[PDB]
Write a protein that holds these residues in place. Structure first.
Motif, PDB file in Angstrom:
ATOM      1  N   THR C 251       0.832  -1.200   0.000  1.00 27.76           N
ATOM      2  CA  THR C 251       0.000   0.000   0.000  1.00 27.76           C
ATOM      3  C   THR C 251       0.869   1.253   0.000  1.00 27.76           C
ATOM      4  OG1 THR C 251      -1.821  -1.084   1.183  1.00 27.76           O
ATOM      5  CG2 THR C 251      -1.728   1.325   1.280  1.00 27.76           C
ATOM      6  N   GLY C 252       0.772   2.032  -1.076  1.00 34.29           N
ATOM      7  CA  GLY C 252       1.567   3.239  -1.201  1.00 34.29           C
ATOM      8  C   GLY C 252       2.778   2.967  -2.075  1.00 34.29           C
ATOM      9  N   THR C 253       2.958   1.704  -2.448  1.00 35.43           N
ATOM     10  CA  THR C 253       4.083   1.302  -3.283  1.00 35.43           C
ATOM     11  C   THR C 253       3.612   0.732  -4.616  1.00 35.43           C
ATOM     12  OG1 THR C 253       4.184  -0.884  -2.230  1.00 35.43           O
ATOM     13  CG2 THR C 253       5.535   0.866  -1.276  1.00 35.43           C
ATOM     14  N   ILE C 254       3.176  -0.525  -4.648  1.00 33.04           N
ATOM     15  CA  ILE C 254       2.722  -1.088  -5.915  1.00 33.04           C
ATOM     16  C   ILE C 254       1.285  -0.664  -6.214  1.00 33.04           C
ATOM     17  CG2 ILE C 254       4.207  -3.080  -5.473  1.00 33.04           C
ATOM     18  CD1 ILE C 254       1.758  -4.779  -5.118  1.00 33.04           C
ATOM     19  N   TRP C 255       0.514  -0.395  -5.168  1.00 34.36           N
ATOM     20  CA  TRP C 255      -0.859   0.058  -5.340  1.00 34.36           C
ATOM     21  C   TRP C 255      -1.039   1.262  -4.432  1.00 34.36           C
ATOM     22  CZ3 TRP C 255      -4.951  -1.046  -8.527  1.00 34.36           C
ATOM     23  CH2 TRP C 255      -6.164  -0.422  -8.191  1.00 34.36           C
ATOM     24  N   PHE C 256      -1.509   2.366  -5.006  1.00 37.90           N
ATOM     25  CA  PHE C 256      -1.708   3.588  -4.243  1.00 37.90           C
ATOM     26  C   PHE C 256      -3.039   4.269  -4.547  1.00 37.90           C
ATOM     27  CE2 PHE C 256      -0.569   5.586  -8.175  1.00 37.90           C
ATOM     28  CZ  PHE C 256       0.480   4.825  -8.684  1.00 37.90           C
ATOM     29  N   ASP C 257      -3.878   3.637  -5.358  1.00 35.66           N
ATOM     30  CA  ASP C 257      -5.179   4.224  -5.664  1.00 35.66           C
ATOM     31  C   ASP C 257      -6.216   3.685  -4.671  1.00 35.66           C
ATOM     32  OD1 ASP C 257      -4.415   5.767  -8.066  1.00 35.66           O
ATOM     33  OD2 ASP C 257      -4.083   3.805  -8.991  1.00 35.66           O
ATOM     34  N   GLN C 258      -7.500   3.835  -4.978  1.00 39.50           N
ATOM     35  CA  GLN C 258      -8.552   3.349  -4.086  1.00 39.50           C
ATOM     36  C   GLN C 258      -8.636   1.824  -4.211  1.00 39.50           C
ATOM     37  OE1 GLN C 258     -11.068   6.129  -2.545  1.00 39.50           O
ATOM     38  NE2 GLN C 258      -8.933   6.784  -2.723  1.00 39.50           N
ATOM     39  N   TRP C 259      -8.485   1.123  -3.089  1.00 35.82           N
ATOM     40  CA  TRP C 259      -8.533  -0.341  -3.099  1.00 35.82           C
ATOM     41  C   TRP C 259      -9.814  -0.937  -3.679  1.00 35.82           C
ATOM     42  CZ3 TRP C 259      -4.900  -3.522  -3.552  1.00 35.82           C
ATOM     43  CH2 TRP C 259      -3.674  -3.383  -2.878  1.00 35.82           C
ATOM     44  N   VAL C 260     -10.946  -0.274  -3.485  1.00 36.79           N
ATOM     45  CA  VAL C 260     -12.189  -0.800  -4.030  1.00 36.79           C
ATOM     46  C   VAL C 260     -12.099  -0.973  -5.552  1.00 36.79           C
ATOM     47  CG1 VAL C 260     -13.236   1.497  -4.327  1.00 36.79           C
ATOM     48  CG2 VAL C 260     -14.692  -0.545  -4.130  1.00 36.79           C
ATOM     49  N   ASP C 261     -11.366  -0.085  -6.224  1.00 38.91           N
ATOM     50  CA  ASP C 261     -11.239  -0.165  -7.683  1.00 38.91           C
ATOM     51  C   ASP C 261     -10.357  -1.292  -8.214  1.00 38.91           C
ATOM     52  OD1 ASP C 261     -12.960   2.023  -8.539  1.00 38.91           O
ATOM     53  OD2 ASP C 261     -11.491   3.350  -7.601  1.00 38.91           O
ATOM     54  N   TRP C 262      -9.531  -1.864  -7.352  1.00 40.93           N
ATOM     55  CA  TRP C 262      -8.655  -2.961  -7.752  1.00 40.93           C
ATOM     56  C   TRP C 262      -9.474  -4.163  -8.218  1.00 40.93           C
ATOM     57  CZ3 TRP C 262      -8.396  -7.979  -5.761  1.00 40.93           C
ATOM     58  CH2 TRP C 262      -7.305  -8.756  -6.191  1.00 40.93           C
ATOM     59  N   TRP C 263     -10.638  -4.355  -7.604  1.00 39.30           N
ATOM     60  CA  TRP C 263     -11.499  -5.484  -7.925  1.00 39.30           C
ATOM     61  C   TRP C 263     -12.166  -5.432  -9.297  1.00 39.30           C
ATOM     62  CZ3 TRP C 263     -11.696  -9.505  -4.356  1.00 39.30           C
ATOM     63  CH2 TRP C 263     -11.067  -9.229  -3.128  1.00 39.30           C
ATOM     64  N   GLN C 264     -11.973  -4.340 -10.025  1.00 44.46           N
ATOM     65  CA  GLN C 264     -12.589  -4.228 -11.342  1.00 44.46           C
ATOM     66  C   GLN C 264     -11.978  -5.146 -12.397  1.00 44.46           C
ATOM     67  OE1 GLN C 264     -13.889  -0.452 -13.069  1.00 44.46           O
ATOM     68  NE2 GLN C 264     -13.631   0.570 -11.075  1.00 44.46           N
TER      69      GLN C 264
END
Ligand SMILES: CCCCCCCCCCCCCCCCCC(=O)OC[C@H](COP(=O)([O-])OCC(O)COP(=O)([O-])OC[C@@H](COC(=O)CCCCCCCCCCCCCCCCC)OC(=O)CCCCCCCCCCCCCCCCC)OC(=O)CCCCCCCCCCCCCCCCC
Ligand code: BCL
Ligand code: BCL
Ligand code: BCL
Ligand code: BCL
Ligand code: BCL
Ligand SMILES: CC[C@H]1c2cc3[nH]c4c(c3C)C(=O)[C@H](C(=O)OC)c4c3nc(cc4[nH]c(cc(n2)[C@@H]1C)c(C(C)=O)c4C)[C@@H](C)[C@@H]3CCC(=O)OC/C=C(\C)CCC[C@H](C)CCC[C@H](C)CCCC(C)C
Ligand SMILES: COC(C)(C)C/C=C/C(C)=C/C=C/C(C)=C/C=C/C(C)=C\C=C\C=C(C)\C=C\C=C(/C)CC/C=C(\C)CCC=C(C)C
Ligand SMILES: CCCCCCCCCCCC[N+](C)(C)[O-]
Ligand SMILES: CCCCCCCCCCCC[N+](C)(C)[O-]
Ligand SMILES: CCCCCCCCCCCC[N+](C)(C)[O-]
Ligand SMILES: [Cl-]
Ligand SMILES: [Fe+2]
Lengths: 301, 238, 281
Positions: C251-264
Motif C-alpha cells: 500500500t503506497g508502493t505497488i498500489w496507491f489508488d482506491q482499493w475498491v477499484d482494484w477489484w474491477q
C-alpha cells in the motif's frame, strides 16, 4: 539438521478410532470417513465419524436453507445468467426491509421479506447448533466450556442482527447478506456513529483480538518448544507436572516474570478470546441506542 | 449515562478477572523458596488460591493444588556465589545426575493410560493394526550421532494408540540392549536417522525402561531430559 | 525467590555473548548479555520520550506523542524536536525488541527447549519494521511512519486507511483479518476443550485427550489433534501478522489508488464484461 516439529516426519495408522462412548447414543454416530495423508502431515489424518441426531439434522437443514435463500436472491439479481452470477458474486446482496416497515413482517419478498426469511433460518441454525455444543459435551460428561465460549460469539451476532435492530425500532438497522455489502455496512456504521475508535468497548475488543494472536503465538510456540518432553499432552501434565510444564513455566518467569501453569494458561486462552466478542457486543449494542456519536461522548465522559 | 456505567463496571470486572487469572496460575510451584529450599520472605502480591481437587481416572487417586511441594529427588548442584541470583554448578555429571537442561521431574512411575485404561504408548510391533502410513519408514535404519558415528539401529517405533502418532524410536545398541529416542529429537533421512543432541558414546547412558513393552511417565521424563541435555553438555563432541 | 522446582534449572551456560559475565538473575528475571542490551536500549528510549514530552509541553500519558520527520525531510535526518527524537527512539525500540528476542534464545539454550517462541516473536518485530522502516523507505520518507502516542497512532491508522477509500477492499488485508478471526476462534475452542476435559461435570473423573477428539468429531466430524492444535494456533497467528505486513508493504508502493477499484479487473474480464444484467451491467 534439527527437526522443528511443524510437520510430521512419519505417519502411523491403526484401526479407525470410533471414540469414547460414555452416555452417547451410538446409534446417532456415522461411520468413519476417509483418511487424509495430506492432513496427516500437520494434524490428524482421520475424518469422521460425526454425530448427527435430531437437533443436528435441524441445524444443517436451516443452515442450508439460509444459504440457499440468499443464493436464490443472487441468481435472481444475476438475471439467472451463470456468467453474471460469477462476475458480480461479491456485489450481490440480500438487504433487510426499509425503515418504513419498522419491525413488521409486512415488507414485500423482494424488499425485505426474503431477508427476514433467511434470517429466521440462520437464527434456528445457530441456536440449535449451540444446543449441540452443550449436549455433545454433556453426553461425554465434560464441562460446558465450549457452549459458554460459543455463547460469546453468539452475543455479537445476536446484537448485530436482532437485539440492536429491535431496540432501534427497525430491521433496516440489521446487517445485509453479501460479501462487499457487509463490508460497506461496517464502514458506514462507524462513520454514522462518530468513528468507532472513540468507542471504548470497540478499542478493548481490538486489544483482545490482537491479544489472542499474541497469546496463541506464545502458547503454540511454547508447547512445540517443549514437545520434546511430551508438552502437548496437556491433560496429563496438569494431573502430574512434568519437566515440559516446568521448563515452559520458567521460560516465561525468566523472560517476563509471569506466573504460569499448564491449566492456568488455558484460562488465559479462553478468556482472551471470549472477551473479543463480549466487549464487542456491548460496544455495538450501546451504539445508536444510548450513544449517537462516540467522539462527542468521549469529549464529556 | 449508561455508557459510562457500563465501561466503568467492565474495568472493575476486568481487575477481578486478572486477579483470578494470576492466582489460578499459582497452583504449581508456590510457595516461593530461597535457593536453599526454605520458604521465601517475599511471596508476591497475590495470596494462594483455595485448593481444588482433580479426580484421576482408573483409580489413580486425586491431585490437590496448591499443595505441599517437594522435588522428591536429589539435586546435584552447588552455589557458585555468596549471594542470591547466580548459577549453581553441577557437582558431578549433569547428564547422569539429571540437572540443568538434562533435568527430569519425579512423575508417577506408571504409564499414561488412554480412555479405556490401556497403556497410551506401545511399541508398534505390539499394537494391533498399527503401521507406517506415510513418510520414510525409519525402522531398520542406522542411527548417527553428532560425532558422525553410528550408535545403533532403529528396531521399532513406539506409538500413541489413541492419537495415532509416533512418539519414540526404539534404538538397538551394539550390546544388544535398546533405548528410546524422542521422535522430536531425531531427523529421519533416506539412509539414516540423525541425532544432533547426542554423540555416539552417550547413547549407552540414556536411561533404560524396566519393562520392554511399556514406559512410565517417570521414565519418559528421564529419557527426554537426558537427550535434550545433550545439546548443551554433549556440545564438546558435536 | 524461586519456584519450588526451579533450582535444578538455574545452571550456568547458554549465553551467546560474554560467557559467564552476565549469566545471572535479578529476582525472577534472567539477565544475560541481551538482558543488559535490552535495558540499555529501553532506558535510553524511555529517557528520550520523557525529553520529547518536555519539549511537547505535557506529562499526560494520554497526550505525549512523538512524531516522525515531516515528509519534506525525506529519508534524511531531522532536528531532534522535529522528528529527530522519533528517529533515535525508533532505533532504540528496534534494538530493544531484537535484544529481547536474542535474550529469549539464551533462555531457550539454558532450558534445553526449542526456539519457536523467539522465532514467532520475530514476526511481530517484522510487522513493526514494516510500518516504521521498510514501507517508509520504499515510499521515500520517514513521515509515512506512525507516531508514538496512545491516541495519535490511531489517528494515523484511520487517516492512512481512508487515504485509499475503505481499506476493507485491500485483498491482503482481507486475508489477514480472516486469520485473526480464525485464530481467536481456535484459541477460544482450544482453551474451552482442554478445560472442559480437566474440569468435567461435578464429581466425575478428569477426561482424556481421547474424549477431546471424540467431542470435536461428534461436533464437526473432525479433530486436528493435540499436537495439531498448537501447530494450527502458531500458523494462524503468524499468517495473520504476515499478511498484515504484506497488506501494508504493498500500500503506497505497488498500489496507491482506491482499493475498491482494484477489484474491477475481474468484472472487466473479456468473456462476461459486457453481458447485460447483474450489478455491473
Ligand atoms: C451485558 C453482558 C451480556 C453478555 C452475554 C454473553 C455470555 C458470555 C459468557 C462467557 C462465559 C464463559 C467463559 C469460560 C468459563 O470458564 O466458564 C466455564 C463455566 C463452567 O462450565 P461447566 O461445565 O458448567 O463446569 C465444569 C466444572 O464443574 C467447573 O469448571 P471451572 O472451574 O473450569 O469453571 C468455574 C468458573 C465459573 O465461571 C463463571 O461463572 C463465569 C462468570 C460470569 C461472567 C460473565 C460476563 C459478565 C461481564 C461483566 C461486565 C458488566 C458490564 C455490562 O470460575 C471462573 O471462571 C470465575 C470468573 C472470574 C470472574 C471475576 C469476577 C470479578 C467481579 C468484581 C470483583 C472486584 C475485585 C477487584 C480485586 O461456566 C459457568 O460457570 C456459567 C456461566 C454462564 C453465563 C450465562 C449468561 C446468560 C446470558
Ligand atoms: C497493530 C496495527 C497498528 C495499531 C493499531 C491499533 C488499534 C486500532 C488499537 C490499538 C491499540 C493499542 N495499541 Mg496500537 N497499533 C500499532 C502499533 C502498536 C505498537 C507497536 C510498537 O508496533 C504498540 C506498542 C502499540 C500499543 C497499543 C496499546 C496502547 C493499545 C492496546 C494494545 C494491545 O492489547 O495489543 C495486544 C497485545 C497484548 C495483549 C500484549 C500486552 C501489551 C500492551 C499492554 C503493551 C502496551 C504498551 C504501551 C502503553 C506503550 C509502552 C510505551 C512505554 C514508553 C514503554 N500499538 C500499529 C500502528 N492499536 C488499541 C487502543 O486501545 O488504543 C488506544 C486499539 O483500539
Ligand atoms: C506475531 C504474532 C503476535 C505476537 C507474538 C508475540 C510473541 C511470540 C512474543 C511477543 C512478545 C511481546 N509482545 Mg506480542 N505479538 C503480537 C502483537 C503484539 C502487540 C499488538 C499491538 O498487537 C503488542 C503491543 C505486543 C506486545 C508484546 C510485548 C508484551 C512482548 C515484547 C516485550 C519487549 O520487546 O520488550 C522489550 C522492550 C521494552 C521493555 C520497551 C522498549 C520501549 C522503548 C524503546 C519505546 C518504544 C515505544 C514505541 C515503539 C511504541 C510506543 C507507542 C505506542 C504505539 C502507543 N505484541 C502479534 C499479533 N509477541 C514476547 C513476549 O515476551 O511476550 C510476553 C514474545 O515472546
Ligand atoms: C471503517 C471500519 C471501522 C470498524 C467498524 C467496526 C464495526 C462496525 C464492528 C467492528 C467490530 C470489530 N472491529 Mg472494528 N472498525 C474499524 C477499525 C478496526 C481495526 C483497525 C486496525 O483499524 C481493527 C483491528 C478492528 C477490529 C474489530 C474487532 C475487534 C471487532 C470484531 C471482533 C470479531 O471477532 O468479529 C467477528 C466475529 C463475529 C462477527 C461473530 C460471528 C458469530 C457466529 C454466530 C457466526 C455464525 C456463522 C455461521 C452461521 C456462518 C456459517 C459459515 C460456514 C462455516 C460455511 N476494527 C474502523 C474504525 N468494527 C465489531 C465490534 O464488536 O465492534 C465493537 C463490529 O460490529
Ligand atoms: C465484525 C464486523 C463485521 C464484519 C467485518 C468483516 C471484515 C472487515 C472482514 C470480514 C471478513 C469475512 N466475514 Mg465479516 N463481519 C461481520 C460479521 C460476519 C458474519 C456474521 C454471521 O455475523 C459472517 C458470517 C461473516 C463472514 C465473513 C467472511 C466472508 C469473511 C471471512 C470470515 C472468517 O475468516 O471467519 C472465521 C471463521 C472461519 C474461517 C470458519 C470457516 C467459514 C468461512 C468460509 C467464512 C464464511 C463465508 C460465508 C459467509 C459465505 C462465502 C460464500 C461465497 C459464495 C463465496 N462476517 C460483522 C458484520 N468481516 C473478511 C473478508 O475477507 O471479507 C471478504 C474481512 O476482511
Ligand atoms: C479506518 C481504518 C481502516 C483500516 C486501516 C488499516 C491500517 C492503516 C492498518 C491496518 C492494519 C490492520 N488492520 Mg485494518 N483498517 C480497517 C479495518 C479493520 C478491521 C475491521 C473489523 O473493520 C480489522 C479487523 C482490521 C485488522 C487489521 C489487521 C489485519 C492489521 C493490524 C494488526 C497488525 O498489523 O499487527 C501486527 C503487530 C504489530 C505491529 C505489533 C508489534 C509490536 C512488537 C514488535 C513489540 C511492542 C512492544 C512494547 C512497546 C511493549 C511495552 C513494554 C512492556 C510490555 C511493559 N482492520 C479500516 C477500514 N488497517 C495494520 C497493519 O497491517 O499493519 C501491518 C495497519 O497499518
Ligand atoms: C469467541 C469469539 C470467536 C468465536 C468463537 C466460537 N465460534 C464458535 C464456537 C466458538 C467458541 C463454537 O463452539 C462453534 C463451533 O462449532 O466451532 C467449531 C463456533 C462456530 N463459529 C463459526 C463461524 C464463525 N465464528 C466467527 C467468529 C468467532 N467465533 C470469534 C472470533 C466468525 C467470523 C465471521 O469471524 C465465523 C464465520 C462456525 C464455524 C461455528 C458455528 C456453526 C453454526 O452455527 O452453524 C450453523 C449453520 C450450519 C449448520 C450450516 C451448514
Ligand atoms: C451456487 O448456487 C446455489 C444457489 C446452489 C447456492 C449459492 C449460494 C450463495 C452464493 C450464497 C451466498 C451467501 C453469502 C455471501 C452470505 C453472507 C453472509 C454475511 C457476509 C454476513 C452476515 C452477517 C450477519 C449477521 C450479523 C446476521 C445476524 C442474524 C440474526 C441475528 C438472525 C435474526 C433473526 C431475524 C431477523 C428473524 C426474526 C425471528 C423471530 C424468532 C421472530
Ligand atoms: C417467519 C418469517 C416471516 C416472512 C414474511 C413474508 C411476508 N410477505 C408479506 C412478504 O409475504
Ligand atoms: C484477560 C486479558 C487482559 C489483557 C488486555 C489489555 C488491555 C489494553 C488497554 C488499552 C485499552 C484502552 N481503552 C479504554 C481506551 O480502550
Ligand atoms: C535492521 C535495521 C535497523 C534500523 C531502524 C531505524 C530507522 C530510523 C533511522 C533514521 C536514520 C536517519 N538518518 C538518515 C540520518 O540516517
Ligand atoms: Cl504458553
Ligand atoms: Fe494448549
Amino acid at each position: 539438521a534439527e527437526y522443528q516439529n511443524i510437520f510430521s516426519q512419519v505417519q502411523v495408522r491403526g484401526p479407525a478410532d470410533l471414540g469414547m462412548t460414555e452416555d452417547v447414543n451410538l446409534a446417532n454416530r456415522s461411520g468413519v470417513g476417509p483418511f487424509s495423508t495430506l492432513l496427516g502431515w500437520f494434524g490428524n489424518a482421520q475424518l469422521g465419524p460425526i454425530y448427527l441426531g435430531s437437533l443436528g439434522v435441524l441445524s444443517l437443514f436451516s443452515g442450508l436453507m439460509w444459504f440457499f435463500t440468499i443464493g436464490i436472491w443472487f441468481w435472481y439479481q444475476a438475471g439467472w445468467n451463470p456468467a453474471v452470477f460469477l462476475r458480480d458474486l461479491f456485489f450481490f446482496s440480500l438487504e433487510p426491509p426499509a425503515p418504513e416497515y419498522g419491525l413488521s413482517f409486512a415488507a414485500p419478498l423482494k424488499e425485505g421479506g426474503l431477508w427476514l426469511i433467511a434470517s429466521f433460518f440462520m437464527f434456528v441454525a445457530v441456536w440449535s447448533w449451540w444446543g449441540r455444543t452443550y449436549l455433545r459435551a454433556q453426553a461425554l460428561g465434560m464441562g460446558k466450556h465450549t457452549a459458554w465460549a460459543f455463547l460469546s460469539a453468539i452475543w455479537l451476532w445476536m446484537v448485530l442482527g436482532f437485539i440492536r435492530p429491535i431496540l432501534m425500532g427497525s430491521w433496516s438497522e440489521a446487517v445485509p447478506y453479501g460479501i462487499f455489502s457487509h463490508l460497506d455496512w461496517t464502514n458506514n456504521f462507524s462513520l454514522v456513529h462518530g468513528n468507532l475508535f472513540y468507542n471504548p468497548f470497540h478499542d478493548l475488543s481490538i486489544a483482545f483480538l490482537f491479544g489472542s494472536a499474541h497469546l496463541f503465538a506464545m502458547h503454540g510456540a511454547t508447547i512445540l518448544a517443549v514437545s520434546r518432553f511430551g508438552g502437548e499432552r496437556e491433560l496429563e501434565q496438569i494431573a502430574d507436572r512434568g519437566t515440559a510444564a516446568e521448563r515452559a513455566a520458567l521460560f516465561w518467569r525468566w523472560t517476563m516474570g509471569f506466573n504460569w501453569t499448564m491449566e492456568g494458561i488455558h484460562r488465559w486462552a479462553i478468556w482472551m478470546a471470549v472477551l473479543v466478542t463480549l466487549t464487542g457486543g456491548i460496544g455495538i449494542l450501546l451504539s445508536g441506542t444510548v450513544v449517537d456519536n462516540w467522539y462527542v461522548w468521549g469529549q464529556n465522559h | 449515562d449508561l455508557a459510562s456505567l457500563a465501561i466503568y463496571s467492565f474495568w472493575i470486572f476486568l481487575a477481578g478477572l486478572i486477579y483470578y487469572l494470576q492466582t489460578e496460575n499459582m497452583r504449581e510451584g508456590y510457595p516461593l523458596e530461597n535457593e536453599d529450599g526454605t520458604p521465601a520472605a517475599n511471596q508476591g502480591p497475590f495470596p494462594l488460591p483455595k485448593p481444588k481437587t482433580f479426580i484421576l481416572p482408573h483409580g489413580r487417586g486425586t491431585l490437590t493444588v496448591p499443595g505441599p511441594e517437594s522435588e522428591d529427588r536429589p539435586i546435584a548442584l552447588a552455589r557458585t556465589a555468596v549471594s542470591e541470583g547466580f548459577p549453581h554448578a553441577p557437582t558431578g555429571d549433569p547428564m547422569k545426575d539429571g540437572v540443568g537442561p538434562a533435568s527430569w521431574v519425579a512423575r508417577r512411575d506408571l504409564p499414561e493410560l488412554d480412555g479405556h485404561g490401556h497403556n497410551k504408548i506401545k511399541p508398534m510391533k505390539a499394537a494391533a493394526g498399527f503401521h507406517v502410513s506415510a513418510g520414510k519408514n525409519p525402522i531398520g535404519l542406522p542411527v548417527r550421532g553428532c560425532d558422525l558415528e553410528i550408535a545403533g539401529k532403529v528396531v521399532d517405533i513406539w506409538v500413541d494408540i489413541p492419537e495415532q502418532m509416533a512418539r519414540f524410536l526404539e534404538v538397538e545398541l551394539k550390546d544388544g540392549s535398546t533405548r528410546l529416542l524422542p521422535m522430536q529429537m531425531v531427523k529421519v533421512q533416506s539412509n539414516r536417522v540423525h541425532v544432533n543432541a547426542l554423540s555416539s558414546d552417550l547413547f549407552a547412558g540414556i536411561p533404560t525402561i524396566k519393562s520392554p513393552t511399556e514406559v512410565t511417565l517417570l521414565e519418559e521424563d528421564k529419557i527426554c531430559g537426558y537427550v535434550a541435555g545433550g545439546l548443551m553438555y554433549a556440545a564438546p563432541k558435536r | 525467590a524461586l519456584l519450588s522446582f526451579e533450582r535444578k534449572y538455574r545452571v550456568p551456560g547458554g549465553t551467546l555473548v560474554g560467557g559467564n559475565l552476565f549469566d545471572f538473575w535479578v529476582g525472577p528475571f534472567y539477565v544475560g548479555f541481551f538482558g543488559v542490551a535490552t535495558f540499555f536500549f529501553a532506558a535510553l528510549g524511555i529517557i528520550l520520550i520523557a525529553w520529547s514530552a518536555v519539549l511537547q509541553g505535557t506529562w499526560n500519558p494520554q497526550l505525549i506523542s512523538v512524531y516522525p520527520p515531516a515528509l519534506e525531510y525525506g529519508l534524511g535526518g531531522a532536528p531532534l524536536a522535529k522528528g529527530g527524537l522519533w528517529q533515535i527512539i525508533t532505533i532504540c525500540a528496534t534494538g530493544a525488541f531484537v535484544s529481547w528476542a536474542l535474550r529469549e534464545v539464551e533462555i531457550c539454550r539454558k532450558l534445553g527447549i526449542g526456539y519457536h517462541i523467539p522465532f514467532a516473536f520475530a514476526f511481530a518485530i517484522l510487522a513493526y519494521l514494516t510500518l516504521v522502516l521498510f514501507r517508509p523507505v520504499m515510499m521515500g520518507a520517514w513521515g509515512y511512519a506512525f507516531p508514538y502516542g496512545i491516541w495519535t497512532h490511531l489517528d494515523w491508522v484511520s487517516n492512512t486507511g481512508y487515504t485509499y477509500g475503505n481499506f476493507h477492499y485491500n485483498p491482503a488485508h482481507m486475508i489477514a483479518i480472516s486469520f485473526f478471526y480464525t485464530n481467536a476462534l481456535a484459541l477460544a475452542l482450544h482453551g474451552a476443550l482442554v478445560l472442559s476435559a480437566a474440569n468435567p461435570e461435578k464429581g466425575k473423573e478428569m477426561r482424556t485427550p481421547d474424549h477431546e477428539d471424540t467431542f470435536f468429531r461428534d461436533l464437526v466430524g473432525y479433530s486436528i489433534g493435540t499436537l495439531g492444535i498448537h501447530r494450527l494456533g502458531l500458523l494462524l497467528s503468524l499468517s495473520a501478522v504476515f499478511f498484515s505486513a504484506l497488506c501494508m508493504i504493498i500500500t503506497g508502493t505497488i498500489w496507491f489508488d482506491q482499493w475498491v477499484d482494484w477489484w474491477q479487473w475481474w468484472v472487466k474480464l473479456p468473456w462476461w464484461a459486457n453481458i447485460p444484467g447483474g450489478i455491473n451491467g
